[PDB]
Amino acid sequence: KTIVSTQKVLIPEGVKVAINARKVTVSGKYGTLRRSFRHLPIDIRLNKLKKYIKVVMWFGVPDSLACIRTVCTHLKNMFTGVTKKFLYKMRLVHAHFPINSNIVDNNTRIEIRNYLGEKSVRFVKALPGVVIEKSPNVKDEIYVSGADIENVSLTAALIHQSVLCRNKDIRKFLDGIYVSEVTTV
Amino acid sequence: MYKKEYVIDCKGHLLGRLASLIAKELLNGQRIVAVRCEDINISGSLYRNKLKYQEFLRLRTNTNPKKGPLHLREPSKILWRCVRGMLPHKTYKGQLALKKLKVCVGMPYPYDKKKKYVLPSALRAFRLKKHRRYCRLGTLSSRVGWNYDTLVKKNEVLRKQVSKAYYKKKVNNLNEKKEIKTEALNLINPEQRQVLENFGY
Amino acid sequence: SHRKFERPRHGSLGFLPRKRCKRLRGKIRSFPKDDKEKPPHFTAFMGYKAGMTHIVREVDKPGSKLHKKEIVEACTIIECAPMVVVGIVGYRETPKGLRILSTVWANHVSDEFRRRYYKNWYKSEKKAFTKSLNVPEATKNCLLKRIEKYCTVLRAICHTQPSKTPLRMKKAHIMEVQINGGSMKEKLEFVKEMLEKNLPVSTVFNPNEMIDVISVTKGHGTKGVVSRYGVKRLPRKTHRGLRKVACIGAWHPARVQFQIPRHGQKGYFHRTERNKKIYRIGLKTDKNSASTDADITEKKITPMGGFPHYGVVNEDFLLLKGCVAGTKKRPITLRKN
Amino acid sequence: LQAVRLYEKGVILGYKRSQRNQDPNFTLISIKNVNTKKHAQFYVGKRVAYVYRTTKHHDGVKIKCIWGKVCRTHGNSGVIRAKFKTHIPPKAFGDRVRILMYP
């Protein structure tokens, strides 16, 4: 256990940042960045002509010395993601009924049907400003995108858990909505 | 302790520590008016304090709940009951001390413009580790059935606007009173001038 | 030890204490809620015991065994001696509850309404509402401006007129009826035209909606447990009578719990009846209002032989689902859902 | 203006007691601006006046004073023990007392 713990980030050349009250204000290409991190003890060193962010924790004992690691990889991935959109790789899955999609209202209020033949209404949402839309290459694929790591990630997270059935063995009943890989624009 | 009455802003104050300080003041004989009791903080998770209040709620006289412990879900009443638990309310002197206390949510009419004092020995920022969990008495009361939290907030924002405007007037009054001091000074005789300067006035 | 055979408790604990109601009218605890999107209209009405009868109908619920075949139903036809709107009350929200800012009275107040403020009207000087109705319009404009600026709930003080009914009572019944709608700035105009006249129902009361009834049940004085809570009668061999509860509690707690049925007052209770859907609109004078084009006879709301223990009905009619609590001549309050 | 003060304010706490046991010979008194034992020691020889008012006259006056003096400090938070000619009545707990500047 020791006193100064910090990482020297390498700020991407395609962004421009600033700091105030543990509220970092950044501008990339797609837009501007801020977030509330007031749950953690965090200080910042910053440069702009010479650049690089340093998020520093003082007297960080190891239980919370991993808050830093989280944010240090997280924000470093944040600017990269907002520059180059983060693209996971999800396949709509079906063993018997090829999935019915009624995508009403411009990527907002997505619908799911043809999943065990209930023929009822179901709809799970996502984040605003994040797209999870059909890939014209294959009908069984919906490409996700976005600018934030969490933006591209909850929009792939909230979906696997939305239309689950009852009284079927997953070892043989292989129904699901899969998410496999991550790529970029 | 030696004032006619002390008005205490309960925002950001830990419930038990605040109650102990208030109870000792009341027992010594100082009248206390506690305002904004819905912003009192309690250490421990909101779910923890929720469980504690449900344990309190399931508690009642089986024969006749009318006689049972009244639960008093308003945050001001919660602070009042906590204070009462820290003084001998069964005695005459303890009852007088209990009645010498007033508790409010928000700031009612005769507390817009008297000074609100703060007990730093009970402030969350000085009594709780930043990485540790705390709750808010207004939220806890709303979870256990107070349902007046939003109205208190909307009244509080109007109070904030009124206070903002009147403080903005007061600072202009104060800086004008300061700039008239400047040439009230150099027109004063040197022997008084020197005394005022060297004694920091 | 445990009971050998379980059975649900006698009576409901949600209607305690089973004591006499403090009033005769049916008071409303809660009015229907309001929303921002919705437009501004009326909220409730009132009247006297009007009649809860059948009316022949036909199901259309897909998959019933009756459906196309004729059915008989049960609902109520309601009474409206036109209520007179005489006052306005403004309420504003506070952490201590919803509190009156002020009430404004109409420039001219009836005598039936004035009679309610007295216990011996015949011997009085009839001085009530004599110098408070000649105030200038300036105070009205100076405080109704505050009403919209500070108050969030608006109610109209209305009163019945028993002189249009066979009641012996001459005092009017007084109540307040909320007003519902959306945004406050659309209420100032709408609360400025109907502030003196009497109340025609058809403005809001419309087919295919739900309303509720509230009143005071009949009185039966003191009655035993067998009638108050419907407890099991004891066997005929019982020594000191059989119309009682055998065990009124275990040894411990060494007290009688409040859940034990006991002798006491039954009836003359305060009750609200829910889920009554309104169905039809009608009048008092018109002749083709109650019957239909399938029957085309001649008759209306009018009764026959005289209403036993009531008299004759000469006011408006409608149609609403349900049946109603209370005795004859009892004031009944009609709320919406 | 008028009515010069030249005395320090105090409040009569209870007697010199333990838990569930009292010694009415000494009464605890808290002084206005003292919060430490070292500062409380500054007032030792000083006389203490408990000035109260009665419902009716006793010498043509409605005011009676009983006299005492601070004997020692109590605790380390600026509370003193005072000994009076007669024991302070418990109805006077929380009342105002004068720590006079003499001797």
Place this chain on the structure above:
RNA sequence: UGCGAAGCUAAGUCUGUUGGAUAAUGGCUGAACGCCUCUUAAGCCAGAAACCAUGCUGAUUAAACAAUACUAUCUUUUUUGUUUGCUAAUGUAAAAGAGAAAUUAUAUAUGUACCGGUACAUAAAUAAUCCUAUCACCUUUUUCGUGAGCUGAGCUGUGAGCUAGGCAAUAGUUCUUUAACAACAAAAAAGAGCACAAACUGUAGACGACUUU
């Protein structure tokens, strides 16, 4: 024998709601440990007849309170006092300068100007501060502000001053420094209806109470 109004009565008819956080589970990120990794790391969501509300019943369960309507000779200043059961009349849980209006964040906030962002100031023992106290009296030279009466403005009064003058305190060493607030009584000056009972009712009822005329 019968119905058996109505009453009472079921063995009949009528009626018997939607909102919040919410366990396991699944996840976002991602360390410890190069990298994997629901967190025996940190921060964020999906989600039950249970819970709390909503709704309903009481509310002398709060010795609770509000608005309204009418009425009761009634209400404001001054002086002296409150040192047959009665017919003048006083009580303090706390006066001694009881002095003090931003809001907020605690790993910094607050202002001002621009479009939460920018820039600049302010703040960081912060009440360890600031504000208010004694210059009596009278006389004279006058100065600047607020109210009565008067037509942005003249006069009087008031508050604060400036110049100059001469004028007071004394009770023997302290026994509380009789100094606050509120009330009351007397004397002066000014202005300013109803309920119970009774009869009736029976929507009520052991009696009270309740509903009525």
Place this chain on the structure above:
RNA sequence: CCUUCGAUGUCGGCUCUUCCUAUCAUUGGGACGCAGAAGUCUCAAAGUGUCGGAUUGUUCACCCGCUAAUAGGGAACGUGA
């Protein structure tokens, strides 16, 4: 054998109320040697409900049925002014 022998009315049933959960059914779940059914193990949960009878003084029991289930208990072996 600690209290009660200048007396605490000693079985069962009937009636009535409340409480516990070690949950029988109902609610929402996880697992299965789980295709579906029907079930078995298990989690959060005590809100609601847990019956009609033949024999026997019986508790206990055992049959006939219905049910969705006919779960286990406490309250001075709850309850004899």
Place this chain on the structure above:
RNA sequence: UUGGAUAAGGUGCCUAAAUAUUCGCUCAUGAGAUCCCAUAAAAGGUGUUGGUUCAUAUGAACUAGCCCUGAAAAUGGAUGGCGCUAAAGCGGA
């Protein structure tokens, strides 16, 4: 009886005296809290820290403080109560 000073025990309020100083540990969706004393075990623990042991700043195996599971009962309920987490808890000084 009058003063002084203490024992046992305490000093957040109830309750007289420390929201004392100083160093660590602990977060509990049933934390813990003074002999007698008012219950708790076997079995599971890569959080902390000092460890101890061996393998070429590099892995495990143990070990032990606190915390958690194990840990279910009947009127409503008791570290004595309130409450307490930069402790008012645990182990010292």
Place this chain on the structure above:
RNA sequence: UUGUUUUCACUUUCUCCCCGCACUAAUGUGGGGAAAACUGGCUUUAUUUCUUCAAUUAUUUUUUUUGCUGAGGA
């Protein structure tokens, strides 16, 4: 069956240089070397009031402000 001695490795720096050449938390840093030694210690000189002369113990002499008590009557 021990004493005894010898061997090297250490410390001050805002010293400086070079490499990463800014990679520093800084008005520098990670690595390799030169510097004197403004650090320091050592031996002296007259002084301890320019500035320390402490802490503990033993042995002594006082001092500030004050609470309570006054038996007796030779």
